Subunit: 161 residues, 2 copies
């Protein structure tokens, strides 16, 4: 056991000890669909139904997500690494993907384990990222719920119950 | 694939499709140490180093966590289910556990995969929970980083890379 004070490799390693799923959050941008892969999602409230996620303020897409009225969180299954990588920095994004929209105009990705279609609810700055809180208006689930894509200790993998 | 509108079982099942680690967040309460098991932790910012978590407003411990100046997030390893259950609602809490304090007086639990000692930074209400943002002042890591306790689809389990 070792202790240090933040001040950068060591901090990233430590924060990576918290296991997560992987989400792609999408929105209609000023000149086309946009998405961003994050793992900073949390389920926040049941009544009302609220969730949060944290866009990087160092992304050129940050402003579009901060200004959006509507955005959708996609929880990926373990077979969807390619979708994850598309919406990482430097990935293909929606290039080659079918345009499919929600009733509110949000671009979405078919066939994810869960999609939460959200209305913007609150936003707060938080250092090098923002915290966006959304109200869930619609939920879509597909397939079994117990095969998530998991990211932990810097690696992709699976959940073993 | 099925779609529904929140309005309650179905929503909980869907939100459970997002895999997480398990954290116990601790603080010095008015009459002793307090802790709370949550999975709503996220890593938020690297510079400055910030993290968030969401205490339930339906907990009698909520006020103590909302008023605290300092609190510590413990990320559990896969061998620490018992510690997780202690700080769930109705668990033993710190009964029978060694009192060990940080320099700032926060009660802590030895031997977790990671402990983030935090100073309160911001707080916001969010339906049936709050969102507490803390600044990380100290990081402790123990053991391998790639054996987290994972909670997904309502079940405890492990990460398989």
């Amino acid at each position: 056991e070792i202790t240090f004070h933040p001040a950068a490799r060591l901090l990233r390693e430590a924060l990576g000890r918290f296991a997560t799923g992987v989400t792609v959050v999408t929105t209609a941008g000023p000149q086309g669909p946009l998405g961003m892969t994050v793992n900073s999602f949390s389920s926040v409230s049941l009544e009302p139904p609220l969730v949060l996620w944290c866009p990087a303020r160092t992304s050129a897409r940050h402003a579009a997500f901060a200004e959006a009225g509507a955005w959708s969180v996609h929880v990926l299954g373990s077979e969807q690494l390619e979708t994850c990588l598309r919406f990482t920095r430097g990935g293909r994004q929606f290039e080659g993907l079918d345009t499919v929209l929600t009733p509110e105009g949000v671009p979405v990705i078919p066939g994810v384990a869960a999609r939460f279609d959200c209305a913007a609810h609150a936003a707060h700055e938080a250092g090098d990222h923002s915290v966006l809180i959304g109200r869930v208006l619609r939920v879509t689930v597909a397939g079994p719920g117990d095969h998530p894509l998991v990211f932990a200790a810097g690696r992709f993998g699976q959940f073993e119950p």
